[PDB]
């Protein structure tokens, strides 16, 4: 049970290696380096942060914040929606 988790599995396909490469660079130091080593597509990094960091059914200012630096709009609208 986690509407937001399902929202990360869908938006993950709309990120591609391009958006994953951006949030990954900013993650180097912000979230950690070992976290990116385990990541592979996108839902992986969203599963660790949601586990314990700054992600929840109604609290994702950290992840959405990175999307703000990327200057996105469709990804920030869906994520911010479930938030």
29-37 contacts at long range (C-beta below 8 A, 24 or more positions apart): 30/66
- What is the distance of C-alpha 52 from the center of its chain? 13
Q: Which domain holds residue 51?
A: 1-83
Find out whether 4 and 57 touch, Cβ atoms under 8 Å: yes
Tell me how many domains the chain contains: 1
Find out whether 23 and 14 touch, Cβ atoms under 8 Å: no
Give the span between the Cα atoms of 13 and 42, in whole angstroms. Answer: 8
Give the span between the Cα atoms of 21 and 59, in whole angstroms. Answer: 23
Resolved by: NMR
Give the span between the Cα atoms of 41 and 44, in whole angstroms. Answer: 7
3-state secondary structure the chain: CCHHHHHHHHHHHCCHHHHHHHHHHHHHHHCCCHHHHHCCCCHHHHHHHHHCCCCECCECHHHHHHHHHHCCCHHHHHHHHHC
CATH code for the domain in which residue 8 is found: 1.10.533.10
8 exposure class (CB count in 10 Å sphere: 0-12, 13-18, 19+): buried
């Amino acid at each position: 049970m986690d509407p937001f988790l399902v929202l990360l599995h869908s938006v993950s396909s709309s990120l591609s290696s391009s958006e994953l490469t951006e949030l990954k660079y900013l993650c180097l130091g912000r979230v950690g380096k070992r976290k990116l080593e385990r990541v592979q597509s996108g839902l992986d990094l969203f599963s660790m942060l949601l586990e314990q960091n700054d992600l929840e059914p109604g609290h994702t200012e950290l992840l959405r914040e990175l999307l703000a630096s990327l200057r996105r709009h469709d990804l920030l609208r869906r994520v911010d929606d479930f938030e």
